Amino acid sequence: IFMGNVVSYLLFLLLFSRVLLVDFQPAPPGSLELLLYFWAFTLLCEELRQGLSGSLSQRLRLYLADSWNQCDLVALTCFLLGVGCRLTPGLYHLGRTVLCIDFMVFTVRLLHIFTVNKQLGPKIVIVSKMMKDVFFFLFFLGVWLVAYGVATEGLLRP
Amino acid sequence: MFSYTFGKVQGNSDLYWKAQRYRLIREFHSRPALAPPFIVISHLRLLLRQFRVYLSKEAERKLLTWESVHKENFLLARARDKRESDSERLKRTSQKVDLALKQLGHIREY
Amino acid sequence: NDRPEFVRLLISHGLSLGHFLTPMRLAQLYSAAPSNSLIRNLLDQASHPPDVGHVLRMLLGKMCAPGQAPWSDLLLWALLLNRAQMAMYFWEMGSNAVSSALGACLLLRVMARLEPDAEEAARRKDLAFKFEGMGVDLFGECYRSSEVRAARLLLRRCPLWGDATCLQLAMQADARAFFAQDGVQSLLTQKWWGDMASTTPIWALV
Amino acid sequence: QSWIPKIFKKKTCTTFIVDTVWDSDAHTTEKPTDAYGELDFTGAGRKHSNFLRLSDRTDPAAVYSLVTRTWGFRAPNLVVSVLGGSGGPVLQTWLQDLLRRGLVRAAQSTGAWIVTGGLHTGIGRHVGVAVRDHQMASTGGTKVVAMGVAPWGVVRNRDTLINPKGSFPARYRWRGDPEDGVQFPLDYNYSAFFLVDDGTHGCLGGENRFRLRLESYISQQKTGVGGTGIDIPVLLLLIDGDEKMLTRIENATQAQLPCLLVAGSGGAADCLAETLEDTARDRIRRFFPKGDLEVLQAQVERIMTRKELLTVYSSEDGSEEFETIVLKALVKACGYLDELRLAVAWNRVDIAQSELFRGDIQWRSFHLEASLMDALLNDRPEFVRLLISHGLSLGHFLTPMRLAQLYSAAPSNSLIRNLLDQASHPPDVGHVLRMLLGKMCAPGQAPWSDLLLWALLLNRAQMAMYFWEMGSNAVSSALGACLLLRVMARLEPDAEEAARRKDLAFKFEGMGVDLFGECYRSSEVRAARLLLRRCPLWGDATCLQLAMQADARAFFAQDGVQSLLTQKWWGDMASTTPIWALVLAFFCPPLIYTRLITFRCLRRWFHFWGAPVTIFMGNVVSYLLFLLLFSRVLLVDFQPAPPGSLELLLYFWAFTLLCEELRQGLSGSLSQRLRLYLADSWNQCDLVALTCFLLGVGCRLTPGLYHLGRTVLCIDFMVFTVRLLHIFTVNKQLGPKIVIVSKMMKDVFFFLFFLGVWLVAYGVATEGLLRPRDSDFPSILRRVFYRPYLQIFGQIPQEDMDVALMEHSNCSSEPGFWAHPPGAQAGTCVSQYANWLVVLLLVIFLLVANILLVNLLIAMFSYTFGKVQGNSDLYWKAQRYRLIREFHSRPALAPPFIVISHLRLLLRQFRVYLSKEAERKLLTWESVHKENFLLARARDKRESDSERLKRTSQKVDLALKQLGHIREY
Ligand SMILES: Nc1ncnc2c1ncn2[C@@H]1O[C@H](COP(=O)(O)OP(=O)(O)OP(=O)(O)O)[C@@H](O)[C@H]1O
Ligand SMILES: Nc1ncnc2c1ncn2[C@@H]1O[C@H](COP(=O)(O)OP(=O)(O)OP(=O)(O)O)[C@@H](O)[C@H]1O
């Protein structure tokens, strides 16, 4: 079942990229875009089933307290928002942009899918423990960038 | 910093992954055998219709007796290991030297 | 009076525990908790004879909450009152040892959250770690003896703990040391491969 | 089980006679039994006993087989039947001390069965109290086994035991009833209960006949594995008693059962003891008032008739002297058994030491051989060590019949039993060794090697170690033991038995390492001769061959073996020869005759050009020149024209390389050798290289497929070049790091997986945002994967992605604003709707890939390197011998000239040899070093703080005993 779902998710990403890079036009949606809509609907139904089978309020709070389920909810919400924007005649480019970012959000869930895998799992969970070092690096880099960039811009006087 | 943190969190991350492996396997066992977008088929079934062993009493009794035998062996081994340590040997030697002193005092009195 | 050595000595000497422990005696045992203890607070809440069943239901939820020698009753009493040595003795004299160790770990970890005192919570967590270690050691012994019977012991439902399996109790108790031993991991691999052989190559599966 | 009622009966009365004589056998009918199974004493949290209601006329064989096999009771090494028991719940304190400290302690130490009445009254109650008190103040020792032979009819609340289907969890009411002098409960301190139903109710004494028959039957069984041991000793202990007890003693004496009478007890015990020490009627009158004198006197006379079966436990004797007294009661009954065989039947090595040390008796060779056979069969290494340290001829002891008996002592479930059964399609140990270790590795006078092989096959660690310590070819036997144990651990159905075999193999490998270290510290030349000699015990295999077969990396890793390998690597030259000197002599042959190379005309020439290091250097030079020729042909001489002279020379060189590979594959059954060759990764790479060379040459020779041949040969050159790493694996400097490199592939794969996911996400997002007009499939793949991949290496094309750096042109008919990227493989027109997001995505991509992923990979590499350093070094040290041997086995010529030597090998189709004197001297030297090493280890163990504390505790116990003796008087 894990292998089948991995293959299905890879094909879903392939279809998503095919629709995003080729089939996405200001015209009404075509067959492949509607197939992508149906596939995202089935993904949403699976997520809803998993949330139900996991009181209603306590279960919803449990679902919304999980970081990866927050990411999956963000993915599905952005997909819905981009589709709604695109179907509106005015907001086609906004829908394209939202769906472009939503593709990244969908793709980064391969790590969460393969967390169960024996080889990738421990290192994937180690990766999340490096964010404090990353944030220290970003803070020091931001301070240095501000100082150096403002000094150079002031010296050069463009 | 990355090298230090990696070396520091290696073992705890491995233990966490081992602990969560059961939940991941259970979750993959609970899901439909179909893959999307075909899962909707199975979903319709789950919309229309709405990791364990079972042992007989004899088999359960035999299994519990076997477990009790292993528990008693483990407890006996632990007790033997504690008794034969140097701390307990020294304690018993001190107690027996106290007993010898008492007997020597009794002899010395008369 | 919390004298574990005396109870061990008196039970090692001949004595019928099933005849000893009457419901009045069990009520007296539960009425020996300090008025400032967490168990006294829970019993007072459940009384809106003791209500140990209600306390267990509210602590471990359901399907995890729990004549003849009643070692399980005495173990539950000693766990609720946080008496480490007597709880360990009653575990050593009981029957469903691995599941009772996991359930004791779960109950102690649950009650350590409801502790107003940080030191009492630390004591409960220490006792829970000791019980988890006892379960790990006993399952290691059993698995070295026999893998099939160890797997049956791990996957059976214990009626003492609400028909919960050992894996469910360990997951609820967050007993990572129990999940980390080789027998449990190999059983998990065997369940992962289902009705196929765990040694099946990945390329063959593809 | 469910078969018990079919073979065990119960007696129910049919003929009614009022209280003319009720016969127990004539007026009763036997029916399938209804009371059998296990007992749970309700309320008490104790283990379940095993109970059986059985007829009075039940043969002891069936019940004994039920106890030993069905109920899982070990056969007793001794049976003490306790009789008598004066009326009164209170015994004399000294008698209670005798029952607890003397009887129960001895029963636990010797593994005996205590047999008495199982009821909670009288001597049964007192023995139960003794067992309880012993267990309360007890260590982690095995529990005492108690049997209660009690009448069915006086068992209180026995109706709860009746269930024809089998009352396995039979709940028994053992307390709470008013005390009565007729019915008594079952004492729960007893492991098993035999309820002898003779048909009566409330009558005592109907079970004595079955009890005596059972004791007599047990007296005829054999101890130990099989029926090889001595008859099980059965002793009757008598305390107090009455006239019926005198009848019991008379019957037991007539049944040839020794009786130990406790002096100071009372009637029927002090009476018989006083009569025995007197060697007449007043004693019977005072002990037995209201008893007819004639019958009692005649009974006492019949008792004294067989007075060699009676022993007296005098009041002077203490409890600690119980076992010894039992001994003096058993051997006196014999006059077959002796004290040594009894000490072996029990696990009492102290008794054996005391018996051997006493000088009044002189043990002969047949006593010692019998005891040694018992100790060997029963797995008693301490006894065999003690009996061999005592004088004994091992060559005379071990006969072929005895060795067959030793091999027939293996469990039916053992691996060795399975192998012996397979080989028997006397034992077939030779065939088993042949099938285990192959051939040329598979194995009067003291046969220590035979006993070592027997102990290794049966996996008896302590006896195997002892037989190794007593043997001769110690280093080779340790390596061979390690090899055999590692081989047999694969064929083990049980994982724990395989773990035990691997533990023993590690211990033997450590023993070999320690002994070779000792020998090498003593002398390097003799140690090298010992390492390189052929051991006829292990198929004329050298120690290096045994270590290679056993994968004994710890043996290869010690400094003496490594220095010997270096010496063999340099051949007939000095191991300290500089590498630059070797190069100078290689390129200037006459310089081998100068001071440059210190050897240790024609002979010198062959010595220099036959050394493995010189062959390695020559092959390295040849392979470098082959790669040079390959590159010259590939870059210059490769034309669609027919092949030239250099290309044909390259063809010939590749042919000679293929012939060398074929020779190595042959010299390494045909199918098994081919599978071995194809299971090696580097040989797979070499096969791929040669196959691609052939494929490219075939394509090029075809007129159509010239470019395909060029491409295939271009990749094939890379495959050939990367084999320099495999060539230099043998090198000392590069080897360990080369093998460390292969352990980084998991980190590499994690990096590639994370990078691929990030590349897919970022590239598809950027391609979607930019919307290039030249959206061909290769162009899309390029801009999705290849350009972001190059951004990781500093190739960041801002002008192709940042619209602010482009010229804004109306190059698209679609609504919106567009810009023209100058890049050739860009879309020639891109959207500028949300180009700030493209820039932000580039910033995030650089952060995630160039900073986070790369540094994470560095951290993972550092961790893995530190983790696998030592194991990689050990692996390289282990494989060094095989690499040196392989370079020694190959021709002294280098390709393409090797074909010359190959023709020779086609036309004609690391050891020392010692004389008998030199071999004997070397083996004696090795034995001297082994004995010194063993003595040093024993001294180190004895002088440790643990053993000092243990001896101090023992001597304080002795001092307490002497102080008690002083205090008594
Ligand atoms: N059938 C039995 N076998 C072995 N031990 C027994 C048996 N019955 C009682 N005992 C032990 O004897 C001890 C004292 O019990 P005892 O038989 O003297 O009286 P009781 O029936 O238990 O009590 P009470 O006097 O209140 O009726 C206890 O240790 C008990 O376990
Ligand atoms: N020549 C000898 N030198 C030293 N010890 C010896 C000698 N002969 C026998 N022994 C030892 O004496 C002990 C008993 O052997 P003993 O000489 O009494 O009889 P035996 O010839 O070995 O046996 P048997 O009585 O069966 O002929 C053994 O420990 C044996 O090793």
HEC readout, D627-655: HHHHHHHHHHHCCCCCCCHHHHHHHHHHH
- Determine the Cα–Cα distance for residues D688 and D716; give it in Å rounded to an integer: 8
Would you give the distance in Å from CA D249 to the centre of its chain?
Answer: 50
The protein residue with its alpha carbon nearest to ligand 1, atom 28, reads C14
Give C10-16's long-range contacts (Cβ < 8 A, gap of 24+). Answer: C11/C93, C11/D45, C12/D135, C12/D136, C13/D132, C13/D136, C14/D44, C14/D132, C14/D188, C15/D44, C16/C69, C16/D41, C16/D42, C16/D43, C16/D44, C16/D175
Asked if D188 and D195 touch (Cβ cutoff 8 Å), the reply is no
Q: Could you tell me if D650 and D700 lie in one domain?
A: yes
In degrees, rounded to 5, the angle at the alpha carbon of residue C141 between the alpha carbons of residues C138 and C142 is: 90
- CA–centroid distance, D85 to ligand 1, in Å, is 19
Asked if D816 and D833 touch (Cβ cutoff 8 Å), the reply is yes
| CA-based nearest residue in chain D for residue A107 | D761
Q: Which residues contact D879 (CB under 8 A, 6 or more apart)?
A: D729
- CA–centroid distance, D134 to ligand 1, in Å, is 18
CB-facing half-sphere around the CA of D244: CA atoms within 13 A:
10
Asked if D758 and D848 touch (Cβ cutoff 8 Å), the reply is yes
Q: Chain A partners of B9 at a C-beta cutoff of 8 Å?
A: 126, 129
Which atom of ligand 2 is nearest to D363's Cα?
14
- Determine the Cα–Cα distance for residues D83 and A43; give it in Å rounded to an integer: 83
- Determine the Cα–Cα distance for residues D284 and D754; give it in Å rounded to an integer: 101
Subunit contact D140:B10, Cβ cutoff 8 A = no
- Determine the Cα–Cα distance for residues C79 and C94; give it in Å rounded to an integer: 14
Q: Which chains touch C (3 or more CB pairs under 8 A)?
A: B, D
Closest to D608 (Cα-Cα) out of D626, D630, D592: D592
Name the amino acid, one letter, at C34. Answer: P
- Determine the Cα–Cα distance for residues D283 and D185; give it in Å rounded to an integer: 36
- Report how this structure was experimentally obtained: cryo-EM
| Phi, psi of D119, deg, nearest 5 | -85, 155
Interface-testing mutation among B54, B67, B78, B82, with chain C (most C C-beta atoms within 10 A): B67
Q: Could you tell me if D692 and D781 lie in one domain?
A: no
- Last residue within a domain, chosen from D266, D300, D335: D335
The protein residue with its alpha carbon nearest to ligand 2, atom 23, reads D365
Q: Number of A:D CB contacts under 8 A?
A: 64
Continuous H helices in D391-494: 394-397, 400-407, 415-423, 429-437, 448-457, 461-469, 474-490
Q: Which residues contact C111 (CB under 8 A, 6 or more apart)?
A: C38, C59, C80, C82, C124
Distances (CA, A) of D549 to D41, D480, D554, D873, D886: 59, 9, 13, 19, 15
Q: What is the resolution of this structure in A?
A: 2.6
Asked if D374 and D428 touch (Cβ cutoff 8 Å), the reply is no
- Determine the Cα–Cα distance for residues D573 and D585; give it in Å rounded to an integer: 12
Strand, helix or coil at B24? helix
Distances (CA, A) of D718 to D204, D295, D724, D727: 99, 112, 11, 15
Q: Chain A partners of D833 at a C-beta cutoff of 8 Å?
A: 93, 96-97
- Work out the angle between the directed axes of helices D474-490 and D916-942 (0-180°, nearest 10): 70
Q: Could you tell me if D34 and D52 lie in one domain?
A: yes
- Determine the Cα–Cα distance for residues D191 and D74; give it in Å rounded to an integer: 12
- Determine the Cα–Cα distance for residues D548 and D173; give it in Å rounded to an integer: 67
Among positive and negative, which fits the CA dihedral D904, D907, D910, D914? negative
- Determine the Cα–Cα distance for residues D238 and C146; give it in Å rounded to an integer: 46
Subunit contact A103:D764, Cβ cutoff 8 A = yes
Q: Work out the number of other CB atoms within 10 angstroms of the CB of residue D478.
A: 31
Closest to C188 (Cα-Cα) out of C205, C166, C204: C166
- Can you read off the two tokens belonging to residue B106? 């009794």
- Can you read off the two tokens belonging to residue D660? 């060398």
Asked if D674 and D665 touch (Cβ cutoff 8 Å), the reply is yes
- Can you read off the two tokens belonging to residue C121? 């919570």
Please provide the DSSP assignment of D795-859 as one string: ---HHHH-GGGSEE----SSSS-EEE---TTS-SSEE-TTHHHHHHHHHHHIIIIIIIIHHHHHH
- Determine the Cα–Cα distance for residues B104 and B98; give it in Å rounded to an integer: 10
Asked if C134 and C105 touch (Cβ cutoff 8 Å), the reply is no
- Before B37, cis peptide (omega within 30)? yes
- Determine the Cα–Cα distance for residues C157 and C163; give it in Å rounded to an integer: 4
Name the DSSP class of D184.
Answer: B
Which residues of D14-62 form beta strands (DSSP E)?
28-32, 36-41, 49-55
Strand pairing class (D145-151; D167-172): unpaired
Q: Could you tell me if D33 and D164 lie in one domain?
A: yes
CA distance to partner chain A, nearest, from residue B17 (Å): 6
Asked if A82 and A95 touch (Cβ cutoff 8 Å), the reply is yes
Closest to D740 (Cα-Cα) out of D842, D631, D645, D875: D875
- Determine the Cα–Cα distance for residues B31 and A48; give it in Å rounded to an integer: 12
Q: Could you tell me if D344 and D321 lie in one domain?
A: no
Subunit contact A130:D760, Cβ cutoff 8 A = no
- Determine the Cα–Cα distance for residues A150 and A157; give it in Å rounded to an integer: 10
Q: Which of A21, A111, A127 sits opposite D768 (nearest CB)?
A: A21
Q: Could you tell me if D478 and D454 lie in one domain?
A: yes
Q: Which residues contact B76 (CB under 8 A, 6 or more apart)?
A: D140
Q: Could you tell me if D893 and D843 lie in one domain?
A: no
- Determine the Cα–Cα distance for residues D161 and D173; give it in Å rounded to an integer: 10
- CA–centroid distance, D940 to ligand 1, in Å, is 54
Asked if D802 and D838 touch (Cβ cutoff 8 Å), the reply is yes
Continuous H helices in chain C: 4-12, 17-20, 23-30, 38-46, 52-60, 71-80, 84-92, 97-113, 118-145, 147-155, 166-173, 176-179, 182-192, 202-205
Q: Which residues of D390-417 are buried (b: 16+ CB within 10 A; e: fewer)?
A: bebebeebbeeeebebbbebbeeebbbb
- Can you read off the two tokens belonging to residue D519? 């020998």
Q: Work out the number of other CB atoms within 10 angstroms of the CB of residue D99.
A: 27
* Pocket lining for ligand 1, CB < 6 angstroms: C 13-15; D 120, 128, 174-176, 185-189
Name the DSSP class of D54.
Answer: E
Query: Which residue segment(s) compose the domain that B93 sits in?
Result: 51-110
- Determine the Cα–Cα distance for residues C189 and B22; give it in Å rounded to an integer: 9
Q: Chain B partners of C152 at a C-beta cutoff of 8 Å?
A: 53, 55, 63
- Point out residues after which chain B has a gap (C–N over 2.5 Å): 50
- Determine the Cα–Cα distance for residues D851 and D635; give it in Å rounded to an integer: 39
Q: What is the dihedral of CA D700, D701, D705, D706, to 10 degrees?
A: 40
Q: Could you tell me if D693 and D785 lie in one domain?
A: no
D518 is in an annotated binding site: no
Give the DSSP H or E segment for B80. Answer: helix B57-83
Domain count for chain D, please give it.
6
The protein residue with its alpha carbon nearest to ligand 2, atom 12, reads D391
Q: Work out the number of other CB atoms within 10 angstroms of the CB of residue D945.
A: 9
Q: What is the dihedral of CA A46, A48, A51, A56, to 10 degrees?
A: -160
Environment class of residue D78 by beta-carbon count within 10 Å: exposed (0-12), middle (13-18) or buried (19+)? buried
- Determine the Cα–Cα distance for residues D347 and D110; give it in Å rounded to an integer: 6
Residue with tokens 């080897």: D735
Subunit contact D768:A108, Cβ cutoff 8 A = no
CB-facing half-sphere around the CA of C121: CA atoms within 13 A:
8
Give the DSSP H or E segment for D512. Answer: helix D495-522
Q: Confirm whether D440 is domain-assigned.
A: no
Closest to D161 (Cα-Cα) out of D250, D262, D36, D21: D36
In degrees, rounded to 5, the angle at the alpha carbon of residue D485 between the alpha carbons of residues D479 and D490 is: 135
Would you give the distance in Å from CA D65 to the centre of its chain?
Answer: 32
